[PDB]
Amino acid sequence: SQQVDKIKASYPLFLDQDYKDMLAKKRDGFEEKYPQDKIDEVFQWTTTKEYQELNFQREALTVNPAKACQPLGAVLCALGFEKTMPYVHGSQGCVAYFRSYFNRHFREPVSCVSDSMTEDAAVFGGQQNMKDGLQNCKATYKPDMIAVSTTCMAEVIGDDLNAFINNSKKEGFIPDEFPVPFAHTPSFVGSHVTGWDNMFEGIARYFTLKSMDDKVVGSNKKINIVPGFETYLGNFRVIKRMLSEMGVGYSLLSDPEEVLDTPADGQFRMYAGGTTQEEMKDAPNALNTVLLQPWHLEKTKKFVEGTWKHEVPKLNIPMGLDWTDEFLMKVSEISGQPIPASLTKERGRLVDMMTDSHTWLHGKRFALWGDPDFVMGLVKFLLELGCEPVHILCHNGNKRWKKAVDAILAASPYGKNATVYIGKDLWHLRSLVFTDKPDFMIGNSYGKFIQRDTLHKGKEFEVPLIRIGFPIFDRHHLHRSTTLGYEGAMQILTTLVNSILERLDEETRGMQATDYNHDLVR
Amino acid sequence: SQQVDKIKASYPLFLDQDYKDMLAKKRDGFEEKYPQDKIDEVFQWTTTKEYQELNFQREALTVNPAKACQPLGAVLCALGFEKTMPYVHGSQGCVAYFRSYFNRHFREPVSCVSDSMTEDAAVFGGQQNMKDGLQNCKATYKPDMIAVSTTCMAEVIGDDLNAFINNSKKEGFIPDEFPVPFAHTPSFVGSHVTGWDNMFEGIARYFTLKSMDDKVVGSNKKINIVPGFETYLGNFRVIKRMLSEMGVGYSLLSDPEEVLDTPADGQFRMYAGGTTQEEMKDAPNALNTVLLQPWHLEKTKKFVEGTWKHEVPKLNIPMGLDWTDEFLMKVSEISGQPIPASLTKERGRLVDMMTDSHTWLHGKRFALWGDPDFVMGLVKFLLELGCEPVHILCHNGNKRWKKAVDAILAASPYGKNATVYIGKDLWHLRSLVFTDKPDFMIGNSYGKFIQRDTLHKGKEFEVPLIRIGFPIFDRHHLHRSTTLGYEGAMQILTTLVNSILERLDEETRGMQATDYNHDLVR
Amino acid sequence: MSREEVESLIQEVLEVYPEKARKDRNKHLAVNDPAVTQSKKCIISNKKSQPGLMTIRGCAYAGSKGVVWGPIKDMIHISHGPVGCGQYSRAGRRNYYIGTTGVNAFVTMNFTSDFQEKDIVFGGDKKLAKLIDEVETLFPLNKGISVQSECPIGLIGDDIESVSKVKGAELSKTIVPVRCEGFRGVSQSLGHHIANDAVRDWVLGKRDEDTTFASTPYDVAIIGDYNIGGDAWSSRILLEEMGLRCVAQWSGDGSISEIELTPKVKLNLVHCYRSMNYISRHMEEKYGIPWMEYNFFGPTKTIESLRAIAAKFDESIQKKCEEVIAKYKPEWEAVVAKYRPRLEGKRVMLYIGGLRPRHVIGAYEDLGMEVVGTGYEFAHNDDYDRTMKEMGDSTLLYDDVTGYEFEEFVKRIKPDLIGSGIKEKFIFQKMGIPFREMHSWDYSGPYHGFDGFAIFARDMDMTLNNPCWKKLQAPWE
Amino acid sequence: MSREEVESLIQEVLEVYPEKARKDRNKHLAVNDPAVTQSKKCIISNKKSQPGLMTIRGCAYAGSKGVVWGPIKDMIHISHGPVGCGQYSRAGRRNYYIGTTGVNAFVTMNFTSDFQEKDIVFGGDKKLAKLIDEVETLFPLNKGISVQSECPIGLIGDDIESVSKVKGAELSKTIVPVRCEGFRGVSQSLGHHIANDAVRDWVLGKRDEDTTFASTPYDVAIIGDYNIGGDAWSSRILLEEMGLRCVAQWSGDGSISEIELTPKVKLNLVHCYRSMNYISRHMEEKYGIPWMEYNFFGPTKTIESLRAIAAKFDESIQKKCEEVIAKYKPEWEAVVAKYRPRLEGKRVMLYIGGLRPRHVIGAYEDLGMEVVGTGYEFAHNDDYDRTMKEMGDSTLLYDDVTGYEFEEFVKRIKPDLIGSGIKEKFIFQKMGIPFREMHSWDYSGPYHGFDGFAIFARDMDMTLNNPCWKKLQAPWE
Ligand code: ICS
Ligand code: ICS
Numbered sequence A, B: 001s002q003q004v005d006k007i008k009a010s011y012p013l014f015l016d017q018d019y020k021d022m023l024a025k026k027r028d029g030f031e032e033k034y035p036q037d038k039i040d041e042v043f044q045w046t047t048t049k050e051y052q053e054l055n056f057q058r059e060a061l062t063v064n065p066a067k068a069c070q071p072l073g074a075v076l077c078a079l080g081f082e083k084t085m086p087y088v089h090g091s092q093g094c095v096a097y098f099r100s101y102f103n104r105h106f107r108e109p110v111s112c113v114s115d116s117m118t119e120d121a122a123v124f125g126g127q128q129n130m131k132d133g134l135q136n137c138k139a140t141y142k143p144d145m146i147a148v149s150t151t152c153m154a155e156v157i158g159d160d161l162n163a164f165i166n167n168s169k170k171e172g173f174i175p176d177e178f179p180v181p182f183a184h185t186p187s188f189v190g191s192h193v194t195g196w197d198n199m200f201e202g203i204a205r206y207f208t209l210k211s212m213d214d215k216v217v218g219s220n221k222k223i224n225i226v227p228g229f230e231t232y233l234g235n236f237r238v239i240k241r242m243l244s245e246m247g248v249g250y251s252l253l254s255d256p257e258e259v260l261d262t263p264a265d266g267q268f269r270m271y272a273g274g275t276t277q278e279e280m281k282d283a284p285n286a287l288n289t290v291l292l293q294p295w296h297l298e299k300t301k302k303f304v305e306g307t308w309k310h311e312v313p314k315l316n317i318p319m320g321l322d323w324t325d326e327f328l329m330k331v332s333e334i335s336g337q338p339i340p341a342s343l344t345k346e347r348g349r350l351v352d353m354m355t356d357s358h359t360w361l362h363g364k365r366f367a368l369w370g371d372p373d374f375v376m377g378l379v380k381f382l383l384e385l386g387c388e389p390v391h392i393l394c395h396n397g398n399k400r401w402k403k404a405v406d407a408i409l410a411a412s413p414y415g416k417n418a419t420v421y422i423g424k425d426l427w428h429l430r431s432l433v434f435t436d437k438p439d440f441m442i443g444n445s446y447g448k449f450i451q452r453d454t455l456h457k458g459k460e461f462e463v464p465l466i467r468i469g470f471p472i473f474d475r476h477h478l479h480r481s482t483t484l485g486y487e488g489a490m491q492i493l494t495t496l497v498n499s500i501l502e503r504l505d506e507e508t509r510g511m512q513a514t515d516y517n518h519d520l521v522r
Numbered sequence C, D: 001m002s003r004e005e006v007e008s009l010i011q012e013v014l015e016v017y018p019e020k021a022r023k024d025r026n027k028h029l030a031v032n033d034p035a036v037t038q039s040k041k042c043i044i045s046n047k048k049s050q051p052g053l054m055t056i057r058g059c060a061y062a063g064s065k066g067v068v069w070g071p072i073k074d075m076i077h078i079s080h081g082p083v084g085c086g087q088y089s090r091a092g093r094r095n096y097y098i099g100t101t102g103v104n105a106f107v108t109m110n111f112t113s114d115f116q117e118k119d120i121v122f123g124g125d126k127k128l129a130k131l132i133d134e135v136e137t138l139f140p141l142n143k144g145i146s147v148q149s150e151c152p153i154g155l156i157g158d159d160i161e162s163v164s165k166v167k168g169a170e171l172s173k174t175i176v177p178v179r180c181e182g183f184r185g186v187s188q189s190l191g192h193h194i195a196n197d198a199v200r201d202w203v204l205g206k207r208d209e210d211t212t213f214a215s216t217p218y219d220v221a222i223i224g225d226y227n228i229g230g231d232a233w234s235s236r237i238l239l240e241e242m243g244l245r246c247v248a249q250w251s252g253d254g255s256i257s258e259i260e261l262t263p264k265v266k267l268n269l270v271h272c273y274r275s276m277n278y279i280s281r282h283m284e285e286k287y288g289i290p291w292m293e294y295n296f297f298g299p300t301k302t303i304e305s306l307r308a309i310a311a312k313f314d315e316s317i318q319k320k321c322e323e324v325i326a327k328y329k330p331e332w333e334a335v336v337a338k339y340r341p342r343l344e345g346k347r348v349m350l351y352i353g354g355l356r357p358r359h360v361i362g363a364y365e366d367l368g369m370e371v372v373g374t375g376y377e378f379a380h381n382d383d384y385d386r387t388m389k390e391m392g393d394s395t396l397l398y399d400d401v402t403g404y405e406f407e408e409f410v411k412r413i414k415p416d417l418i419g420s421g422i423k424e425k426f427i428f429q430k431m432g433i434p435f436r437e438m439h440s441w442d443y444s445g446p447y448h449g450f451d452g453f454a455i456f457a458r459d460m461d462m463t464l465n466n467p468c469w470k471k472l473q474a475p476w477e
């Protein structure tokens, strides 16, 4: 039943007695459900060290991964170029998923096409799908560039993208000079970040490999910036802001910030902003190229060093105090521009905030996950804050990266109780937060289910989630935030300390029980 | 007892059994405490309509006010002028409190002096305190201006500020040309916002009353901006940023953003930034003067209109969509500058966010409080969001203001279940949130005690606090936020929707009970 | 718009396309004539998508894993292949259930074999067998396993049927191989069919020789309700108030035992025809169980449906039917009284999957609204046959609409509201057109039944009439 | 620094001042000589502040309402006058208590008469009587009321004593008039004295003729512990483990009845000498109750105190004393072993109110730290007498330090840590000097007793050794 003045949605409608009784009857009559005592017993067992040991012995099963597949990253990369349509050669189901995944994180349209290969293409390949697909896409959506990646069907069948695109041009389906950069992006290799690297290097090659003879390093007086897979609008923005404030000429290569933030003013804009083709063609003339997320830009790095002859600096992601300082100092050296008063002051405001908040942050224990560069920058900043990053999980991390993070942990006393895990998933992490309970998790929305599980053991075992990373689907507008630079460090610090204080207020809210410590001032 | 590797502070130390037992023995032996059944009975009574009716009949008792006293506002106003020392003539206890109050909100130094009047000054007044105080302050702290206000002792004894300052100059305690603007700021009239108005009008008079003959309205091609009592750094910053983006010449009159945000770089800076004396002297030459918080700038308005001959526009605080639009359009009209593409786009990004979040905001009920302009802007924006601002409390509001808010509520269907309360305090508001329970409160840190009370009745009765206003003492760095303009609207919207979603996640976190609605995507 | 204006709009839109695409798309766009009974005279459907045109469709794995199998709560569903499909489809679809997740229920978890290069090169069948053992160790209360094949599995020649047979025998466990690779078919639709045949072949016959279940004359199953936001629960309640016993729900909140008990029922009640007609036909053929289509969207359809269902049973159920109708009458009448005056005359365009584009029309009409365009991602002509009589004369029909087409149709028709999916939502909001998600219910619902109608009405009103929509034009422009 | 270097620092700093201020301030600054017993040979104190110099002091209302009365949990304390004093002092001081706030306890609430112009012009006594009736109606479980006068009350000639007498008789209620207007005295100090005399005159004698209390030989009161962060609880536990019975806590977590029972005890244990020596002397004069000073900061002082207290009782208490000391030995030894190597040799400057600037020195020394400067806002010469022997030779002493002086002293001395209040904290952090709040405990504590020493040590280490302090200098500067 409903009362028209106070309509109930699923929660709390199904808590009404009639629904409760109905659901009990369904269970008892037809579900042949395990007894509650047995459910409780098994749940308790899944919180134990014994279960954790079995869990960490898995070799074949993955549960609740913390990564996605290559073409997702190729699509995001492609979206960062002016009037560019991402195009995934292969199966259309994949594209529905990529679009939906990004739609839910950004709360924005996400344009991408498929060439809708079907079973029939297993006999001799997707060449005709490429020809008609490119022609149809160009005519219908009027991009100035089509950036081609692949789904796993196309990779398994072995379609030669280069040959297929070349034949499309030879036979008149798309113009000879129309830009169709490409990359093979097999979903059974690496992860979404690898697809970004692959796509970017493919675009960079397309615009520069054959034209290198007239290029002169430094002749355009700019620094190229390659952001990698990046899902915070504030991160593109802060980098551009800082470089502009320093008077540094730059080119941001792959810049989706406009197309992921168009205004609601009565028209849909399929394309907005983005890196221009002129910027990509001119990129070898830069002084140098800086990689913001080097641990997933290795293929790009080889191309920029080997072909453009840029001496790419060894910089970490610019997260936290020390690594933002290092980024700005290196940009200053390359460009000849001094670090200006505005940035020096901003730095000092971050340091002030660290001094203000250090007593609540000190010794706080975190579990965290995400992509490799994000994770190591978060680890570094946590150490700078006097926090302990005890469970560090990067499903898509590698051995070399793990060695680098272990070295960072070694350089601080705050790293003593920390372990780095690679190849492990959120069902592994769930065990760690039961057996070696931290104060908080820092992670994406999939962490909410871990928080739920911990609360079920009891309130005293609950590990609250702090949402930083990708995807974030259960809060609105967090994609507008910043994690890079001093601005990002300020945002992260603020979020962490206020999560601590919110939880302390919850724990001290009990009248005549714990509210002796429900202080007005903290 | 303590375990050295996991030391307990008060929470949870005093939950140890030995402490619990000790506290029970203290109670039973010596406190002659009302029985718990009686405490429960009285608590329950305090949640009733019968109690509310008695509560609203108060004439003489105030409980948990939502205002402070005049000189607090005078000090904040004074802090916004270059190299200016706030100086409060009267009792030193007041200055310890003003400094501490602002210290705790901004987490910054707050410099202010007293002239330490004692009981002896009741015989013939504080003139000698003024003489030595001005001399001592100038010598020791080297301000370029001393801005004088009063405590209630000085007002009751009847000290003539003007005469005392004049005599201090006559007798050589400070130079004749040294600026010593003043205002009488009696704490038994109005509130802190009134003290701001009084101080500002005094400073404006000091620099302009006697020099009007050479002034020509519009000759400097700027607009003066008077912010009023403002405790969000982002509010000073957003107004400056918008005017700069529009190419509008402006003078922000009282601008404490620098002195309330100095960097931690190894030196203490007693003064930073601020409105210059030259800006105040030249202010009558502006095109016009815009008051950002007109409901506490009435004395200032009469002076600017009567003496500077500026035709101050009838503008509401620039909060929410409509009133930010109106502010920009009026500034365009006055300055001749078009509204730029950047601001048009920012507006459309706010509207996009409104479209994205409207389904969770719709129909949500709020109790809220604060100063009159802030409260009315928050009410207006809530109506724009499709929310219902059901209990609107402004302790320091007046009848004319209440009429204006009642008219805003009449212009929207979302205002139908709303009531505006003036002269009422947070003990009145506590009753309203029991008898006509809203979904959330929007208010300052004193609201935490109302949330605590509501939870004690039961989880289903708990009204969570969303911290927006002044003072905020129990979270860190919220003073950096913005509430004005499109930027502030975006911040407020994000805060509100995510507070709704955090609470829904809490309510749906119960395994096999309510977690059928614990959705990944919202 | 007139028939002539709509035909003109179709032709204008199709001018953008190369000839091959133009000729194809013309066959998938029609002006409705409720006077036609054979939709194969009017519109083509269930064909391949044209390359490069930004179809909204998914794949067979979505139709099998995402739609049919995934909701079954006490089984573990393995996304077998590389990591993306299972991750993108993790907890995207609000197929609600009661259970202890990770312990006795598994719906919102993502179990995967996370294929790597060595699995592609040498095959995944050994990995699959090891994975099954790991599942058994770590999730001992699972009541069965399904293997949801992603694109590579059949392309590389793996034999998941053999693995399922051998491991199922070894563990005395139901292990269901599902060949729902996304290269099969053209859309989600073939995944439904594949999934239905897998239930038939591996689950449904288990109790064929068991005589222990006590049946009653009033036993039914709800077939094809995936309990989006609780939709099946707000349907079930009414059927049971009417005196029926709902033995099974396929598959929202569904358990493996209730599937196995379904051959014992007297009548199959089919909500989603598209996705479950196949198994319904099978059950009639094999067990003699009749089936009938029904519609629980809005009071008119719900009342009609209750009466038609009750008519299959005796006078006692028909009497209880009228009691249920009388009970809820004041409730839905109060909803209409509040919301219909807020919505009367407003025009809606829909674009959804395989059922809802026709099934929700009555509920809109109960609020005085008009559906001026509708279409489906993956419907077949039997769906279109059922649609033309539900839609008004001269309204617009679109099969497998392209992104371009949908935007252009909307620019011309200027509906007051659009009801479609997540890939559409943010486009139309920027255009200033109120949008409701008609798959996920925009995180609201249920929408089925009398209790769902209240929420539907509230939701259409909150969005269509929201203050935000008057704010898109800056007052200086 | 040498005595001569400290003397020259003082003279250097005083050069900024006009002559009158310079001559005054010179008398309030001294280089310690532990060889002096009569501090009136070396420093002046408890004089008015010089105008315009940014004293850190508060007022008599702070000393009365904020410090002594406000913590009494089951009374309602009215801030009588305009709205500021009561609002700025609402829940600023962490005087912890157990109770049901708004119902039987009222500490963190702000009750005020919110004076307006008409109250100034015509007086507030009628308003006060009405306010009392309103309090009784809305807060029926209050056990007494105090009236904490703000500046205007005596200036306008109000008669709160008459109101308190008449209303107290009418209502059979303890109503205490307190003339703690901020114009009185020079600092918080006179507010303590005024507050003590109000307890004496209106509360303490209530049970003078009542013999019903079940007294024992081991009854004590804790006098002058305001339970900051639970400090009094972490003291009480030890006294009761030693076999004593703590009848009252003045005034942290204190109730009116425990105050009224205090004249029945055998010994008054005075922690804060400055604030409560007055009532302790009264109780010795009137009731014959001896009193003694003690110190529960750090293990050395706590052990000395326990032994000195136990020596006032019999052998059974002395035996329990040694048992307590033995129990806690491994606990504080573990704290020292962890934290002393992290803090050894570090130098601290303190500036606090009336007690802690000397009382915490031992606890710093238990961690190997050195207090190289200390001073008080409002101490008297009897406090300085007790300080000179606690401080090292040639250390710096400052009475009612000005903001300018404190900054300049710190620039020269370059302490590793500063312990002071909220108005100081943010100044010194910007200078890159670790800072701990030594009034509020920086929202930590307790610091009293053995359990408090652990927290103290943790806190000094977390801040002094924090990684933030190496980061203030930009690497390009
Ligand atoms: S199953 Fe089908 S696309 Fe019948 S695949 Fe799809 S939960 Fe749609 S129109 Mo999403 S044939 Fe169900 C459907 Fe309808 S996932 Fe849901 S809303 S009634
Ligand atoms: S009462 Fe006094 S200023 Fe003895 S007014 Fe002050 S809670 Fe200080 S050095 Mo705040 S004489 Fe207590 C004090 Fe000491 S408020 Fe506390 S810390 S031990």
Ligand SMILES: [Ca+2]
Pocket: A106, A107, A108, B352, B353, B356, C426
């Ligand atoms: Ca959006």
Ligand SMILES: [Ca+2]
Pocket: A352, A353, A356, B106, B107, B108, D426
């Ligand atoms: Ca600060």
Ligand SMILES: [Mg+2]
Pocket: A500, A504
């Ligand atoms: Mg904590």
Ligand SMILES: [Mg+2]
Pocket: B012, B015
């Ligand atoms: Mg504990």
